[PDB]
Design a protein around this ligand. Structure first.
Ligand SMILES: CC(=O)N[C@H](C(=O)N1C[C@H](O)C[C@H]1C(=O)NCc1ccc(-c2scnc2C)cc1)C(C)(C)C
Ligand SMILES: *CCC(=O)Nc1cc(OCc2cnn(C)c2)ccc1S(=O)(=O)N(C)C
Lengths: 146, 87, 101
């Protein structure tokens, strides 16, 4: 795959800093591009972690899989540490569209089997059902890269 | 310039024109000073206006982005309004 | 630093921002430009407290922390004998749907 960690074996220490109000799930893309879940970060916390140069990470809301930003972009790639300094991965909320924010709230209150009972047009039912997904995002980022 | 957005229950919301242009629908209506939303009530339209303020303030900003709050009781109607307004 | 407001009278609500160091009188000049009523024909309030022309918005309680873009603070407005301050509430949301409980 285009999006995958490189097996560099070159250590890089990183500080994951959750500057969001969400519980953050760090996601590591393995050497075949398959995403792997790592321990979650509570809001406003920082974790010093051992990663490697050329590895790829993305960050989501742990409970809903909403996309989050890391250093203002989608993907985080550690580089070599300079003078023993760790690399910062500042995780933040994007400015979601109002429509996406509303879909997040409604999904959080209604079981998918009960989306059918909501008095909304069919297109909004389709929008609710189209949950955020790491596989879908990796496909999109793959096209954006090419 | 300011523009007036009127709710179904007659509240008039006066907002900066550039902020109302956050909505693609409102932008098109103003292309192409007052718009009447016959199906959007004031408990929803007031929240839409807060969203415009939030979007303009925080888009391409470096300062920490806070959550945009939505009470469960308004979420369904606010979703319908956001879908119509394209914002 | 900016402060984010809703200036409200009857069923009119103006969304605007102002510097925390700007004054009550300068906010009446903003209202004038929008609603075409001069400052002497306006009374501005924070809750039922009448605000003094010479105080800054910060000195009245409107600060960056408490008057946020996504949760603006309300400034009440009454026009001129002055009418009583009267802000109509926004509509009541319907009962929460069964599938959201
Ligand atoms: C040489 C190499 O590439 N090793 C990999 C490796 O060690 N990795 C891959 C990523 O770069 C992350 C790194 C790793 O597993 N480090 C240990 C680790 C443990 C906990 C955490 C986290 S994330 C949030 N909280 C914690 C405690 C982060 C990293 C594995 C063993 C998975 C093949
Ligand atoms: C969440 C943990 C963390 O990293 N906090 C933090 C980082 C910080 O980094 C500034 C910086 C300088 N050079 N780079 C590349 C980054 C400054 C402060 C803090 S904090 O005070 O813990 N925080 C709560 C803002």
């Amino acid at each position: 795959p285009v999006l995958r960690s490189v097996n560099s074996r070159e250590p890089s220490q990183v500080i994951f800093c959750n500057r969001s109000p969400r519980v953050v799930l760090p996601v590591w893309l393995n050497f075949d591009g398959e995403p792997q879940p790592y321990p979650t970060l509570p809001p406003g916390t920082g974790r010093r972690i051992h990663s490697y140069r050329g590895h790829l990470w993305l960050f989501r809301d742990a409970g809903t899989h909403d996309g989050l930003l890391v250093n203002q972009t989608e993907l985080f790639v550690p580089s070599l540490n300079v003078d023993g300094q760790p690399i910062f991965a500042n995780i933040t909320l994007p400015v979601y569209t109002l429509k996406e924010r509303c879909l997040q709230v409604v999904r959080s209150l209604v079981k998918p089997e009960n989306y059918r009972r909501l008095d909304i047009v069919r297109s909004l039912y389709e929008d609710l059902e189209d949950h955020p997904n790491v596989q879908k995002d990796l496909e999109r980022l793959t096209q954006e890269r090419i | 310039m300011y523009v007036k957005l009127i709710s179904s229950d007659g509240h008039e919301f006066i907002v900066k024109r550039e902020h109302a242009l956050t909505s693609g629908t409102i932008k098109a209506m103003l292309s192409g000073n007052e718009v009447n939303f016959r199906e959007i009530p004031s408990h929803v339209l007031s929240k839409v206006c807060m969203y415009f303020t939030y979007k303009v303030r925080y888009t391409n900003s470096s300062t920490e982005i806070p959550e945009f709050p939505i009470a469960p009781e308004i979420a369904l109607e606010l979703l319908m309004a956001a879908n119509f307004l394209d914002c | 630093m900016d402060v984010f407001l809703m200036i409200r009278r009857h069923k009119t609500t103006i969304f605007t921002d102002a510097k925390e160091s700007s004054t009550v009188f300068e906010l009446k000049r903003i209202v004038e430009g929008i609603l075409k009523r001069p400052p002497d024909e306006q009374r501005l309030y924070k809750d039922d407290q009448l605000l003094d022309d010479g105080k800054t918005l910060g000195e009245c309680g409107f600060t960056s922390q408490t008057a946020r873009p996504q949760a603006p603070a309300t400034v009440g407005l009454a026009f001129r004998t002055f009418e009583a301050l009267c802000i109509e509430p926004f509509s009541s949301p319907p009962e929460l749907p069964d599938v959201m409980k």
